[PDB]
Amino acid sequence: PELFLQDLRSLVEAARILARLARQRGDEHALERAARWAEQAARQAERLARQARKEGNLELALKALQILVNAAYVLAEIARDRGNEELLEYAARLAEEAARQAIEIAAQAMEEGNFELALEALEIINEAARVLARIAHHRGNQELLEKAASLTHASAALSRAIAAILEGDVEKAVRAAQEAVKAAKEAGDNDMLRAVAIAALRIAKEAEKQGNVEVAVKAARVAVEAAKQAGDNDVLRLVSERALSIAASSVKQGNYEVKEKAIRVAKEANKQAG
Amino acid sequence: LELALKALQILVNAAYVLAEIARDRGNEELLEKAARLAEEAARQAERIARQARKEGNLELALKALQILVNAAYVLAEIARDRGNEELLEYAARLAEEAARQAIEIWAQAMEEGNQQLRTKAAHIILRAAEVLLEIARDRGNQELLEKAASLVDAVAALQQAAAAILEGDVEKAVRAAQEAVKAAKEAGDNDMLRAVAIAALRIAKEAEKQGNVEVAVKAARVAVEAAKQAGDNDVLRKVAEQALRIAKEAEKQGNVEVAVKAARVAVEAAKQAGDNDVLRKVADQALEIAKAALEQGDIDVAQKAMDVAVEALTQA
Amino acid sequence: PRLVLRALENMVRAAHTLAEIARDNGNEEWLERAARLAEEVARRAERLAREARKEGNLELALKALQILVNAAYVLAEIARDRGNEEELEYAARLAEEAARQAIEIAAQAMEEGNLELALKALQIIVNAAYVLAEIARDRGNEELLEKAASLAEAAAALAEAIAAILEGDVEKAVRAAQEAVKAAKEAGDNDMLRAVAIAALRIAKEAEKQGNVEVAVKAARVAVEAAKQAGDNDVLRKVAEQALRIAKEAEKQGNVEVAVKAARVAVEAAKQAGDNDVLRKVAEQALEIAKKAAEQGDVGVMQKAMDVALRAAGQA
């Protein structure tokens, strides 16, 4: 199967070269060839990318999303010099739902603790943010550029939090999570907020694994903040469950104040869930 | 063995950095030294590629070509501010010979069915064309634009055809192949046409397994269009064997009209090859086709079959 | 380990995107954010790189250096458009220090005999030279520009020498090494000189396997030429031990002229080092060389063996 992506890449490269050549040598049918080749390759990639989530090979899926971003760069190059906004709008829609789908993949990877895939999906997100910014630079949307700065900020924050978790540097992780929830507030996207909450959950799970219940309460206080801003009841349920983990762990550590905080956090999560 | 390519890549990268460092400064001696570093690396890489091709490790060979293409890119980047054409004259000729060798590698990979080399070789050829295009962008040679564009769109067709082969879509395969010969014939590159023809054999081999002889003859009609330029006698005999096999399948299907068109392709090739054993086999097959056309009462097809049979047999 | 490298690299890649976006928009605050992120990564990556060498895994270490070089590239891209000298100074310091550590890796790698790691480190060094030069041009400092260029040339010669070490042409290796000492002596970089000497030692070890003591001495003549600039006492000791090993083989070959030249190198090095055990071991062998020069009846060679042994002993 995998060779499909390599061939798609080659067709994208051919399109890139043809576009480069066409900026030297005048032929609108070179532009039309390259656009048709590229769009068809992108749709072929999209079919595979949709299939890959059913197949569960997320590695091939995020590789296909990298192809989509790389193709989107070439599509944007063609479109911006050809001077057509509808093709930019198409490329933008392609990139936007691709990146949103990457955010879903990243949430699964962080739930698994399969941080390998999370870092790679975050890379796809970075490169998508690059391509989105290139499009926005020609459309004039300062709002999208602020969102790109926010998206790159948030993906960096997720990366930093992941690094602190892999290191076990949990106070720095809690500090980084406090930065991350502000970055999510800058972004204003519920799916990013979900990914950040899933990170905050996984962060608290590491503190529970350590038995550092007070660090876990700090992590949970961020997690429930993210979940409260997101409004997702399944996240709020998972947060309430983890808060009861922390509460039981706090009684196991023999401290009533950390129990009291953990119960108040569980009750905040329950109050938002209704 | 392998480490030499890694070192050479580092040498080319070092030359690139040296050239970039020198670029803003009045020191053509640094540029000359960088060019000497690049030339030695290129001479090493060509010698390695020659030997690796003899040994049959195509991955080492194509990686050496990748390095050489990067070296050509560096040589052009040196040559521009130097105002020197002779460097470009070396680089373009070297890049053309590299592209030829990469196309020959691509043909061997297609013949052997090694998709894994095919992708790599395609990327290499595409990069080679990009470097030729940078050279053309500076130098203004319009023929090099035609060469580059046609090479690239021909690789894109070759890739599309390989994708169609993996998908089993013989109609897509024909659609692509028709454009592939269109590009390659406008280029006039007989080695590109050879690679196209070798791919067309693989198209025919799978088209028989699919059993759609009506599409397969359109593919064979493209195959001879290229093969008639290239003139490689063993390739022509291989093509003729495939055309006869296609005719045998068309008889099993009872489609004598497609069988006669398959013979019309077969004679066009056999008339170049001159192989009397092909002429004998063509006449024998044509008589079986005439027998089928008689049995069907398709006598316009029978007379067309025997017109082609006479046209073939008269070459003896 | 592995994940943290990936993550920090991704944090640099994120800073690279953020800097692109910020420069496209013309915004300041996003650069300030990026700079804070990049500095935090630089501080973390320095720790990681220092720890990785203490763990003995040079590959993890050199990858961490490549992260630092990516960070330096981003920091420079920010700083040179930001327009501040202290930022450019800090970036230059970071890149230079990373290059020092990279050469320390390269020295250790060649001393162990893993050219693959050394080649990787040379790519890191080449990258650092590019970054340093881009800083130095935009800052305006010809000394650092010349330093970058000369370092890059010396790196290129070292890469060529590594290629020659793979190939086994010891004359080519010496030809490269002559240019390598030329660049290194013009640069005055202690670690570059150390690296050249270590390479020359392994060149000599291969020349001994081949039995080519003559070219081994030519390599050693470069080795002392470099070592005499730098005073690496243990490298001088290794050079002297090699010179005695070479002299013992030259005695076994009966080439007392090459043996006396090997002693002539050994005393030149020992005169810098002042190591009494080396001096006495050298003089001990120098009388074996004089003994064989007398057995051959070579008057001028025995007069040289006299002159060397006596000058070696005369203040030891």
Numbering used by the authors:
A (entry chain d): 1 to 274
B (entry chain D), C (entry chain N): 1 to 316
Report text from the authors:
Here, we describe a general computational strategy for designing multi-component bifaceted protein nanomaterials with two distinctly addressable sides. The method centers on docking pseudosymmetric heterooligomeric building blocks in architectures with dihedral symmetry and designing an asymmetric protein-protein interface between them. Functionalization of the two distinct faces of the nanoparticles with de novo protein minibinders enabled specific colocalization of two populations of polystyrene microparticles coated with target protein receptors.
